[PDB]
Amino acid sequence: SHMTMEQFLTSLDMIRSGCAPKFKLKTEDLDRLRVGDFNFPPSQDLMCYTKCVSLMAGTVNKKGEFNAPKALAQLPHLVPPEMMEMSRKSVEACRDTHKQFKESCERVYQTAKCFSENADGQFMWP
């Protein structure tokens, strides 16, 4: 019921593989999100890609509403022990970001961006 850092790093690629084919995406954009650099304008496809990833994680519903209690319960299935506290801190800081947006892909993308900005360590997106 926990993952090692090695398993986490590899999981990023497996998660991406289940979402990227549904969209038209630029490799440079994915590379930037992979290192937690959300400092560039996203396309709708890129935003919806973040929703696809989060749906797989079970942290949002299809309306893009972020579920903090469920996200906290899913953390051991998503990140290694080394990143748990950073992630718990970001879940709390970003739990209401979705309330500022109406469209599902934007709700998720803005939440992921908030996680990347609040991260007190390196942040990696699938």
Swiss-Prot record:
Biological function: Odorant-binding protein required for olfactory behavior and for activity of pheromone-sensitive neurons. Binds to alcohols and mediates avoidance behavior to high concentrations of alcohols, the alcohol-binding possibly resulting in activation of receptors on T2B neurons, the activation of these receptors inhibiting these neurons. Acts in concert with Snmp and lush to capture cVA molecules on the surface of Or67d expressing olfactory dendrites and facilitate their transfer to the odorant-receptor Orco complex. Required for cVA response, probably by binding to VA.
GO MF annotations, alphabetized: dibutyl phthalate binding; diphenyl phthalate binding; odorant binding; pheromone binding
GO biological process: courtship behavior; olfactory behavior; response to ethanol; response to pheromone; sensory perception of smell
Gene that this sequence comes from: lush
Tissue: Specifically expressed in chemosensory system in both males and females. Expressed in a subset of trichoid chemosensory sensilla located on the ventral-lateral surface of the third antennal segment. Secreted from non-neuronal support cells into the sensillum lymph that bathes the olfactory neurons within these sensilla.
Binding-site list for ethanol: S54, T59
Keywords: Behavior, Disulfide bond, Olfaction, Pheromone response, Pheromone-binding, Secreted, Sensory transduction, Signal, Transport
Compartments where located: Secreted
UniProt binding sites for 1-propanol: S54, T59
Family statement drawn from the similarity comment of this UniProt entry: Belongs to the PBP/GOBP family.
Name of the protein this chain belongs to: General odorant-binding protein lush
GO CC, one annotated term: extracellular region
List of residues binding butan-1-ol: S54, T59
